Amino acid sequence: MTSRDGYQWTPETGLTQGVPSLGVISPPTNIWDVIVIGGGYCGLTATRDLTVAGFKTLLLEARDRIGGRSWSSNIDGYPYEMGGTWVHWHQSHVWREITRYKMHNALSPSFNFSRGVNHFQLRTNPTTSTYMTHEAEDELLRSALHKFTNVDGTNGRTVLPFPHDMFYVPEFRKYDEMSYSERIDQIRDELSLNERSSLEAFILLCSGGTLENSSFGEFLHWWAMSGYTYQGCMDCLMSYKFKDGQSAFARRFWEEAAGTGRLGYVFGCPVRSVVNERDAARVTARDGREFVAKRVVCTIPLNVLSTIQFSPALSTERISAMQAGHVSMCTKVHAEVDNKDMRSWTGIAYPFNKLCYAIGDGTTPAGNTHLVCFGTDANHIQPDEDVRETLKAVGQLAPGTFGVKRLVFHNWVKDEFAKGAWFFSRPGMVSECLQGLREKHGGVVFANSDWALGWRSFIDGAIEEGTRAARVVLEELG
Amino acid sequence: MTSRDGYQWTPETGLTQGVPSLGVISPPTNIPWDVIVIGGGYCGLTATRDLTVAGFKTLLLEARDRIGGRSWSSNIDGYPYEMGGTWVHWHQSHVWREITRYKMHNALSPSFNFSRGVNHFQLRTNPTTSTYMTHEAEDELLRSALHKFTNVDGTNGRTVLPFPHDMFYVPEFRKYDEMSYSERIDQIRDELSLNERSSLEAFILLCSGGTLENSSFGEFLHWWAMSGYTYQGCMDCLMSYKFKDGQSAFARRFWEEAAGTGRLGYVFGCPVRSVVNERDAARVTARDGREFVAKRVVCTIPLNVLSTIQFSPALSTERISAMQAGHVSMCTKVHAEVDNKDMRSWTGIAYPFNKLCYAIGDGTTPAGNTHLVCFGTDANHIQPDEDVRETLKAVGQLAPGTFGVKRLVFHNWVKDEFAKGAWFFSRPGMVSECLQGLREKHGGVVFANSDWALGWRSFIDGAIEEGTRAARVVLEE
Ligand SMILES: Cc1cc2nc3c(=O)[nH]c(=O)nc-3n(C[C@@H](O)[C@H](O)[C@H](O)COP(=O)(O)OP(=O)(O)OC[C@@H]3O[C@@H](n4cnc5c(N)ncnc54)[C@H](O)[C@H]3O)c2cc1C
Ligand SMILES: Cc1cc2nc3c(=O)[nH]c(=O)nc-3n(C[C@@H](O)[C@H](O)[C@H](O)COP(=O)(O)OP(=O)(O)OC[C@@H]3O[C@@H](n4cnc5c(N)ncnc54)[C@H](O)[C@H]3O)c2cc1C
């Protein structure tokens, strides 16, 4: 079935809105111990866990589909990943779900250097290009990232030995309070233009924000989780994806919860308020429908929380977090291109372009190279507003080398049920707000990847929180 | 309470058998069944936990007087001595998931602590001399040796084994599973110094628990790939972080969750001898003769113990081959509470002349003394219970004239009829040939064990991976 989310473009058709996805459900309602608000991976995991354990559970979702910030669209036999894509066995919670659902052998490597141009193209201004082996690329980045992360002599292993517990070493704090910008000023004189351009594009790829509004320490956190090495990051952040797309993975959570016969659900159901009552909680949609359950697991994203009325009011720490917002404003654009040899191309174009990092990520059934392109708040584009400028930004990644057959993207920034992409914090925000984002609220359990402990902001972190949310509810009732 | 497993030695008390463990279940029973789970190790504990929480009436039948199997801890004078499986990391999916779900992510200790004391690595290649080194220099030497050992494909195994969960993804990988440790060393011999080769062999033998000749090179590549294809990755995953309250506190979490569903039946001290599949049901018979019936059976008995069990209908050709050959890990693990405070920051390799080859300062008891953990392998084997003097000699040769022993603690895994080996490690070619047969349906018997996991095979993680698969399979109803 075809979702309301997403955009597609071809030369023949122009820009159309709405694309297919297995995430679309399916019949939109089939209508409690528990209400779960939101059906991304956090909500899916909580719901799966709770229904399997014997609770009647109602899932309320604003969209016409499951998956939230992660979901895929099969177009002409090719899964286009609209948001969260990549997974790895070094990621505990997603991996456990992958193997339990027997999908550990249903993955593809995004990188294929076995034919074609097999180079990295670095663009530091609009006129000119630098070419490089992928090896040389790997090494440009290791060298840059070593300097960026070596605040303690051990690339973070001393100040953050236990990433799950940021205050184990009291001293990590100053790094959470530091911006990318402040860090770079410290190591500046020691970086070439090539190292710095590569480094800035890489760290901003990770934050989706700006040099000034991105927490250095949050990046140290990603680095630490990944093995405190550049190759560790690439393995964990960008190497392996589902062959059948993230939506086939979300479906497995959905099918299991449904198979218990304890699942109620409503889609197209944007929640407007959550009010604690005597021994229960009442959730009301924008259109006035009301639902009641003993406990509510609320998985609305940080950047959307300020749209909801809660009673009692949320705590002071929750309020600051949501008013400030996280900074990831990532624009992600897929491009089906007519250059077959670009399967093995990668490119960084920084800082002049609105898309700054792109990779050949696959080959469609039609035989065309698929490129994925990323842009950040550093030089922002809204990919839907002016196709001409979006195309010009894709092309500038490799001027004069290809024509575009198709674009596919979803706009996360302008999307009212996301308002941003994956979580990334401002300097000081996690230090300050994480405990609060995570604290009790009577009968409401706030659970989201945005405030995970481990792979925070990742599909993994959604699953971690989701599991934690089910466990809390279980303990409180039973 | 005190288990019958394990041993303790002090100058004052001699050698005593039996040591405390929170893993001991008292009382030893609380008794139709949907599922019988044979074995209360991490694999049995996971499958039972999952099955009972999901609503199944489950009977757990365990040979020992305790849970944990090849992993369990003993609190002696307020210190947890890890008798088997010890270390965990967040790059191990299954164990970590259980740790965070049980909220024990913040209940870990670092084994390594280089912040005071002798702070050096001691390498011994003959009984009369030592070579002293910094920890940095130690890391460097092993990083260099291991780079040469693993660089079969130009990228330290990343090309031939990109998805360790699927070993045959690259068909070229098989030839390496069929190689032995010694086959690979001989290929690079002329490029390794004594110090590089001594360190290398000690490290790779530490991982296999067997000999140069019977350890699969490919299987070491599998551990290497799971850890991140680096030496630091291996250290992080293999030996860095342990539970501050001991592995047995961790297993008790699976137990209490299972117990509190009210759907758990159990019999400790109950060794099984036979499992026969009947019509839509299956019958399990103890040694004493007790019979149990359930619709399906999850059997978590270790590979090396399986041939003691009698199955009907009979197991397949590849299962039989696997259980006759047996895995090679004959690891000896001996704890020494010693009187040298400065050895907190010590590590040593003594190879190949000593019966314990690898050892580390691993903590400090509440009494104030250094805890050393020592390993030996089938390359130069000691049976630590058979003669205390010989065991003290082995310990003392890791660093002669530097300490007196106040206490030893250990369990003999090799002479344990319910393990008959330590963690799984394969012979050349065994995993290629046998894995799938070890994984395969068997009527109403589902065989599950760390020994035949896909990812962290032979690890606690692998037990949990397998226990999880086993609970899922059972439905199926
Ligand atoms: C472009 C992009 C790229 C990414 N890259 C990766 C990657 O490579 N790997 C990775 O692991 N992660 C990646 N991420 C991270 C991302 O996948 C998230 O961290 C994760 O999916 C969040 O899941 P969640 O369940 O915590 O929240 P979400 O997925 O946002 O789900 C919660 C949402 O609650 C619903 N909701 C919101 N408001 C309301 C309301 N008012 N009423 C009812 N329901 C409401 C949303 O519609 C429902 O889907 C990426 C994300 C994006 C956007
Ligand atoms: C010395 C040592 C050090 C190790 N180091 C580490 C480490 O640092 N980190 C790590 O992750 N792993 C380590 N390992 C790996 C190890 O802990 C195992 O891989 C894992 O614990 C096996 O779990 P399992 O539940 O699959 O099997 P087990 O725990 O072996 O299986 C459960 C067992 O089945 C029972 N049983 C056997 N026969 C019968 C019978 N006839 N009837 C009834 N019950 C029977 C056993 O008594 C019961 O406990 C180590 C192991 C050892 C021995």
PDB file of C-alpha atoms in Angstrom, chain B residues 231-434:
ATOM      1  CA  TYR B 231      43.833  -6.864  18.892  1.00  0.00           C
ATOM      2  CA  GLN B 232      42.291  -4.056  20.978  1.00  0.00           C
ATOM      3  CA  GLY B 233      38.865  -5.239  19.812  1.00  0.00           C
ATOM      4  CA  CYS B 234      39.753  -8.709  21.111  1.00  0.00           C
ATOM      5  CA  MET B 235      40.912  -7.369  24.473  1.00  0.00           C
ATOM      6  CA  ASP B 236      37.797  -5.214  24.886  1.00  0.00           C
ATOM      7  CA  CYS B 237      35.490  -8.187  24.168  1.00  0.00           C
ATOM      8  CA  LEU B 238      37.511 -11.113  25.588  1.00  0.00           C
ATOM      9  CA  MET B 239      38.966  -9.869  28.859  1.00  0.00           C
ATOM     10  CA  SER B 240      38.086  -6.368  29.971  1.00  0.00           C
ATOM     11  CA  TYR B 241      34.806  -6.276  31.884  1.00  0.00           C
ATOM     12  CA  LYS B 242      33.224  -8.510  34.491  1.00  0.00           C
ATOM     13  CA  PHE B 243      30.248  -8.340  36.827  1.00  0.00           C
ATOM     14  CA  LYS B 244      31.188  -6.744  40.161  1.00  0.00           C
ATOM     15  CA  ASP B 245      28.814  -9.119  42.031  1.00  0.00           C
ATOM     16  CA  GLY B 246      29.841 -12.148  40.006  1.00  0.00           C
ATOM     17  CA  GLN B 247      28.351 -14.075  37.121  1.00  0.00           C
ATOM     18  CA  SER B 248      26.079 -15.937  39.540  1.00  0.00           C
ATOM     19  CA  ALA B 249      24.210 -12.707  40.458  1.00  0.00           C
ATOM     20  CA  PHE B 250      23.548 -12.367  36.692  1.00  0.00           C
ATOM     21  CA  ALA B 251      22.172 -15.895  36.267  1.00  0.00           C
ATOM     22  CA  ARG B 252      19.899 -15.400  39.339  1.00  0.00           C
ATOM     23  CA  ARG B 253      18.124 -12.657  37.353  1.00  0.00           C
ATOM     24  CA  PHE B 254      17.061 -15.099  34.652  1.00  0.00           C
ATOM     25  CA  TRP B 255      16.063 -17.498  37.438  1.00  0.00           C
ATOM     26  CA  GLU B 256      13.956 -15.102  39.456  1.00  0.00           C
ATOM     27  CA  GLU B 257      12.147 -13.811  36.384  1.00  0.00           C
ATOM     28  CA  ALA B 258      11.361 -17.398  35.379  1.00  0.00           C
ATOM     29  CA  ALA B 259      10.321 -18.347  38.945  1.00  0.00           C
ATOM     30  CA  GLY B 260       8.001 -15.363  39.428  1.00  0.00           C
ATOM     31  CA  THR B 261       5.862 -16.267  36.408  1.00  0.00           C
ATOM     32  CA  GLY B 262       4.572 -19.130  38.551  1.00  0.00           C
ATOM     33  CA  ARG B 263       4.933 -21.461  35.523  1.00  0.00           C
ATOM     34  CA  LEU B 264       8.389 -22.829  36.314  1.00  0.00           C
ATOM     35  CA  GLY B 265       8.945 -26.396  37.519  1.00  0.00           C
ATOM     36  CA  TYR B 266      12.476 -27.555  38.361  1.00  0.00           C
ATOM     37  CA  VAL B 267      14.635 -30.473  39.550  1.00  0.00           C
ATOM     38  CA  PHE B 268      18.266 -29.940  40.542  1.00  0.00           C
ATOM     39  CA  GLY B 269      20.629 -32.862  41.091  1.00  0.00           C
ATOM     40  CA  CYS B 270      18.812 -34.538  38.214  1.00  0.00           C
ATOM     41  CA  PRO B 271      21.162 -35.939  35.525  1.00  0.00           C
ATOM     42  CA  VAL B 272      19.390 -37.144  32.372  1.00  0.00           C
ATOM     43  CA  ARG B 273      20.361 -40.369  30.641  1.00  0.00           C
ATOM     44  CA  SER B 274      17.867 -40.735  27.810  1.00  0.00           C
ATOM     45  CA  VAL B 275      15.448 -38.758  25.687  1.00  0.00           C
ATOM     46  CA  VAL B 276      12.933 -40.676  23.563  1.00  0.00           C
ATOM     47  CA  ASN B 277      10.489 -39.057  21.136  1.00  0.00           C
ATOM     48  CA  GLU B 278       6.977 -40.543  21.364  1.00  0.00           C
ATOM     49  CA  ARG B 279       3.731 -39.519  19.629  1.00  0.00           C
ATOM     50  CA  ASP B 280       3.451 -35.723  19.690  1.00  0.00           C
ATOM     51  CA  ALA B 281       5.102 -35.805  23.131  1.00  0.00           C
ATOM     52  CA  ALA B 282       8.616 -36.791  24.381  1.00  0.00           C
ATOM     53  CA  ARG B 283       9.949 -38.738  27.378  1.00  0.00           C
ATOM     54  CA  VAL B 284      12.984 -37.752  29.484  1.00  0.00           C
ATOM     55  CA  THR B 285      14.496 -40.252  31.933  1.00  0.00           C
ATOM     56  CA  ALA B 286      16.925 -39.441  34.785  1.00  0.00           C
ATOM     57  CA  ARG B 287      19.825 -41.686  35.916  1.00  0.00           C
ATOM     58  CA  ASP B 288      17.907 -42.860  38.996  1.00  0.00           C
ATOM     59  CA  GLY B 289      14.965 -43.691  36.678  1.00  0.00           C
ATOM     60  CA  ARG B 290      12.529 -40.745  37.089  1.00  0.00           C
ATOM     61  CA  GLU B 291      10.513 -40.070  33.958  1.00  0.00           C
ATOM     62  CA  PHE B 292       9.192 -36.766  32.633  1.00  0.00           C
ATOM     63  CA  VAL B 293       6.897 -36.063  29.701  1.00  0.00           C
ATOM     64  CA  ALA B 294       6.440 -32.864  27.742  1.00  0.00           C
ATOM     65  CA  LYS B 295       5.402 -31.961  24.252  1.00  0.00           C
ATOM     66  CA  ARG B 296       8.726 -30.644  23.204  1.00  0.00           C
ATOM     67  CA  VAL B 297      12.280 -30.825  24.797  1.00  0.00           C
ATOM     68  CA  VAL B 298      15.012 -28.172  24.719  1.00  0.00           C
ATOM     69  CA  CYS B 299      18.291 -29.998  25.303  1.00  0.00           C
ATOM     70  CA  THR B 300      21.223 -27.752  26.292  1.00  0.00           C
ATOM     71  CA  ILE B 301      23.741 -30.462  27.194  1.00  0.00           C
ATOM     72  CA  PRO B 302      27.283 -29.474  25.957  1.00  0.00           C
ATOM     73  CA  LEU B 303      28.644 -31.115  22.752  1.00  0.00           C
ATOM     74  CA  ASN B 304      31.418 -32.995  24.646  1.00  0.00           C
ATOM     75  CA  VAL B 305      28.851 -34.509  27.053  1.00  0.00           C
ATOM     76  CA  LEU B 306      26.201 -35.488  24.485  1.00  0.00           C
ATOM     77  CA  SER B 307      27.511 -38.965  23.690  1.00  0.00           C
ATOM     78  CA  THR B 308      26.528 -39.953  27.234  1.00  0.00           C
ATOM     79  CA  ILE B 309      23.004 -39.467  26.322  1.00  0.00           C
ATOM     80  CA  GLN B 310      20.933 -41.927  24.590  1.00  0.00           C
ATOM     81  CA  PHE B 311      18.518 -40.623  22.002  1.00  0.00           C
ATOM     82  CA  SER B 312      15.549 -42.088  20.152  1.00  0.00           C
ATOM     83  CA  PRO B 313      15.388 -41.839  17.332  1.00  0.00           C
ATOM     84  CA  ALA B 314      19.171 -41.792  16.941  1.00  0.00           C
ATOM     85  CA  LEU B 315      21.089 -38.634  16.107  1.00  0.00           C
ATOM     86  CA  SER B 316      22.327 -37.904  12.588  1.00  0.00           C
ATOM     87  CA  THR B 317      25.655 -38.749  10.997  1.00  0.00           C
ATOM     88  CA  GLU B 318      27.097 -35.222  11.408  1.00  0.00           C
ATOM     89  CA  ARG B 319      25.951 -34.907  15.021  1.00  0.00           C
ATOM     90  CA  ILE B 320      27.543 -38.254  15.829  1.00  0.00           C
ATOM     91  CA  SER B 321      30.826 -37.241  14.091  1.00  0.00           C
ATOM     92  CA  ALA B 322      30.860 -33.967  16.008  1.00  0.00           C
ATOM     93  CA  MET B 323      30.352 -35.643  19.408  1.00  0.00           C
ATOM     94  CA  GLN B 324      32.919 -38.403  18.862  1.00  0.00           C
ATOM     95  CA  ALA B 325      35.721 -36.055  17.758  1.00  0.00           C
ATOM     96  CA  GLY B 326      34.778 -33.562  20.497  1.00  0.00           C
ATOM     97  CA  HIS B 327      35.941 -29.981  20.890  1.00  0.00           C
ATOM     98  CA  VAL B 328      39.572 -29.275  21.956  1.00  0.00           C
ATOM     99  CA  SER B 329      39.321 -26.660  24.727  1.00  0.00           C
ATOM    100  CA  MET B 330      40.821 -28.167  27.867  1.00  0.00           C
ATOM    101  CA  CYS B 331      41.380 -24.856  29.564  1.00  0.00           C
ATOM    102  CA  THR B 332      42.610 -24.744  33.154  1.00  0.00           C
ATOM    103  CA  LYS B 333      41.625 -21.656  35.099  1.00  0.00           C
ATOM    104  CA  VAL B 334      43.180 -21.029  38.464  1.00  0.00           C
ATOM    105  CA  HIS B 335      42.726 -18.071  40.787  1.00  0.00           C
ATOM    106  CA  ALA B 336      45.507 -17.066  43.154  1.00  0.00           C
ATOM    107  CA  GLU B 337      45.018 -14.614  45.991  1.00  0.00           C
ATOM    108  CA  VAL B 338      48.616 -13.444  46.444  1.00  0.00           C
ATOM    109  CA  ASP B 339      50.519 -11.232  48.886  1.00  0.00           C
ATOM    110  CA  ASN B 340      52.156  -8.771  46.457  1.00  0.00           C
ATOM    111  CA  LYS B 341      50.053  -5.559  46.346  1.00  0.00           C
ATOM    112  CA  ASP B 342      52.081  -4.218  43.455  1.00  0.00           C
ATOM    113  CA  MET B 343      51.060  -6.952  41.052  1.00  0.00           C
ATOM    114  CA  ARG B 344      47.578  -5.427  40.502  1.00  0.00           C
ATOM    115  CA  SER B 345      49.058  -3.979  37.327  1.00  0.00           C
ATOM    116  CA  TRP B 346      51.004  -7.085  36.249  1.00  0.00           C
ATOM    117  CA  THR B 347      50.524  -9.396  33.301  1.00  0.00           C
ATOM    118  CA  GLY B 348      52.499 -12.405  32.240  1.00  0.00           C
ATOM    119  CA  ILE B 349      53.096 -14.940  29.551  1.00  0.00           C
ATOM    120  CA  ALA B 350      55.116 -18.066  30.344  1.00  0.00           C
ATOM    121  CA  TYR B 351      55.422 -20.172  27.224  1.00  0.00           C
ATOM    122  CA  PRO B 352      55.717 -23.023  26.337  1.00  0.00           C
ATOM    123  CA  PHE B 353      57.418 -24.654  29.390  1.00  0.00           C
ATOM    124  CA  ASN B 354      54.830 -23.857  32.125  1.00  0.00           C
ATOM    125  CA  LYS B 355      51.446 -25.485  32.742  1.00  0.00           C
ATOM    126  CA  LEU B 356      49.863 -22.070  33.189  1.00  0.00           C
ATOM    127  CA  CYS B 357      50.889 -19.866  30.211  1.00  0.00           C
ATOM    128  CA  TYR B 358      48.874 -16.609  30.508  1.00  0.00           C
ATOM    129  CA  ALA B 359      47.995 -14.597  33.620  1.00  0.00           C
ATOM    130  CA  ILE B 360      46.821 -11.169  34.758  1.00  0.00           C
ATOM    131  CA  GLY B 361      46.262  -9.122  37.881  1.00  0.00           C
ATOM    132  CA  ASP B 362      42.463  -9.072  37.880  1.00  0.00           C
ATOM    133  CA  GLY B 363      41.449  -7.323  41.116  1.00  0.00           C
ATOM    134  CA  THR B 364      41.899  -6.782  44.841  1.00  0.00           C
ATOM    135  CA  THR B 365      40.043  -8.696  47.567  1.00  0.00           C
ATOM    136  CA  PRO B 366      38.334  -6.749  50.409  1.00  0.00           C
ATOM    137  CA  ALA B 367      41.138  -8.133  52.627  1.00  0.00           C
ATOM    138  CA  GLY B 368      43.632  -5.993  50.603  1.00  0.00           C
ATOM    139  CA  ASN B 369      45.424  -8.677  48.499  1.00  0.00           C
ATOM    140  CA  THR B 370      46.001  -9.057  44.581  1.00  0.00           C
ATOM    141  CA  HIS B 371      43.927 -11.380  42.669  1.00  0.00           C
ATOM    142  CA  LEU B 372      45.693 -13.108  39.771  1.00  0.00           C
ATOM    143  CA  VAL B 373      43.786 -15.175  37.208  1.00  0.00           C
ATOM    144  CA  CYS B 374      45.810 -17.816  35.380  1.00  0.00           C
ATOM    145  CA  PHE B 375      45.189 -19.949  32.327  1.00  0.00           C
ATOM    146  CA  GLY B 376      46.720 -23.107  30.938  1.00  0.00           C
ATOM    147  CA  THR B 377      45.786 -25.183  27.895  1.00  0.00           C
ATOM    148  CA  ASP B 378      46.107 -28.668  26.457  1.00  0.00           C
ATOM    149  CA  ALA B 379      49.491 -27.606  25.068  1.00  0.00           C
ATOM    150  CA  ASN B 380      51.039 -28.131  28.518  1.00  0.00           C
ATOM    151  CA  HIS B 381      48.223 -29.417  30.696  1.00  0.00           C
ATOM    152  CA  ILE B 382      47.761 -29.369  34.373  1.00  0.00           C
ATOM    153  CA  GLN B 383      44.907 -30.882  36.269  1.00  0.00           C
ATOM    154  CA  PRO B 384      44.859 -28.370  39.133  1.00  0.00           C
ATOM    155  CA  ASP B 385      43.248 -30.581  41.693  1.00  0.00           C
ATOM    156  CA  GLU B 386      45.553 -33.523  41.453  1.00  0.00           C
ATOM    157  CA  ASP B 387      48.505 -32.236  43.358  1.00  0.00           C
ATOM    158  CA  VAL B 388      48.510 -28.782  45.026  1.00  0.00           C
ATOM    159  CA  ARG B 389      52.327 -28.401  44.980  1.00  0.00           C
ATOM    160  CA  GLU B 390      52.391 -28.780  41.186  1.00  0.00           C
ATOM    161  CA  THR B 391      49.684 -26.160  40.880  1.00  0.00           C
ATOM    162  CA  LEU B 392      51.576 -23.768  43.152  1.00  0.00           C
ATOM    163  CA  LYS B 393      54.716 -24.403  41.057  1.00  0.00           C
ATOM    164  CA  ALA B 394      52.792 -23.506  37.861  1.00  0.00           C
ATOM    165  CA  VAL B 395      51.405 -20.327  39.449  1.00  0.00           C
ATOM    166  CA  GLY B 396      54.781 -19.310  40.894  1.00  0.00           C
ATOM    167  CA  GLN B 397      56.647 -19.778  37.583  1.00  0.00           C
ATOM    168  CA  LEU B 398      54.578 -16.947  35.994  1.00  0.00           C
ATOM    169  CA  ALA B 399      56.631 -14.600  38.189  1.00  0.00           C
ATOM    170  CA  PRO B 400      59.200 -16.497  40.371  1.00  0.00           C
ATOM    171  CA  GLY B 401      60.300 -15.095  43.734  1.00  0.00           C
ATOM    172  CA  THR B 402      57.789 -12.258  43.592  1.00  0.00           C
ATOM    173  CA  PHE B 403      54.855 -13.537  45.717  1.00  0.00           C
ATOM    174  CA  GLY B 404      53.457 -15.999  48.225  1.00  0.00           C
ATOM    175  CA  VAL B 405      50.040 -17.537  47.603  1.00  0.00           C
ATOM    176  CA  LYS B 406      47.431 -17.068  50.292  1.00  0.00           C
ATOM    177  CA  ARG B 407      44.631 -18.799  48.413  1.00  0.00           C
ATOM    178  CA  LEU B 408      43.875 -20.770  45.241  1.00  0.00           C
ATOM    179  CA  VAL B 409      40.357 -21.134  43.813  1.00  0.00           C
ATOM    180  CA  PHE B 410      39.305 -23.278  40.875  1.00  0.00           C
ATOM    181  CA  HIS B 411      37.010 -25.759  39.171  1.00  0.00           C
ATOM    182  CA  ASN B 412      38.290 -28.578  36.967  1.00  0.00           C
ATOM    183  CA  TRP B 413      36.243 -28.325  33.739  1.00  0.00           C
ATOM    184  CA  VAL B 414      38.052 -31.159  31.991  1.00  0.00           C
ATOM    185  CA  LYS B 415      37.316 -33.781  34.717  1.00  0.00           C
ATOM    186  CA  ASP B 416      33.745 -32.433  35.155  1.00  0.00           C
ATOM    187  CA  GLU B 417      31.381 -35.147  33.785  1.00  0.00           C
ATOM    188  CA  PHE B 418      28.820 -32.441  32.949  1.00  0.00           C
ATOM    189  CA  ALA B 419      31.259 -30.318  30.884  1.00  0.00           C
ATOM    190  CA  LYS B 420      34.231 -32.497  29.781  1.00  0.00           C
ATOM    191  CA  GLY B 421      35.972 -29.433  28.393  1.00  0.00           C
ATOM    192  CA  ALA B 422      35.780 -25.704  28.832  1.00  0.00           C
ATOM    193  CA  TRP B 423      34.180 -23.409  26.152  1.00  0.00           C
ATOM    194  CA  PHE B 424      33.778 -24.805  22.615  1.00  0.00           C
ATOM    195  CA  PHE B 425      36.723 -24.690  20.253  1.00  0.00           C
ATOM    196  CA  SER B 426      36.934 -26.720  17.061  1.00  0.00           C
ATOM    197  CA  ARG B 427      39.428 -28.967  15.300  1.00  0.00           C
ATOM    198  CA  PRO B 428      40.475 -27.990  11.791  1.00  0.00           C
ATOM    199  CA  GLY B 429      37.459 -28.548   9.546  1.00  0.00           C
ATOM    200  CA  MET B 430      34.939 -29.500  12.229  1.00  0.00           C
ATOM    201  CA  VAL B 431      32.748 -26.341  12.092  1.00  0.00           C
ATOM    202  CA  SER B 432      32.600 -26.387   8.257  1.00  0.00           C
ATOM    203  CA  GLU B 433      31.665 -30.041   8.271  1.00  0.00           C
ATOM    204  CA  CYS B 434      29.421 -30.187  11.382  1.00  0.00           C
TER     205      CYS B 434
END
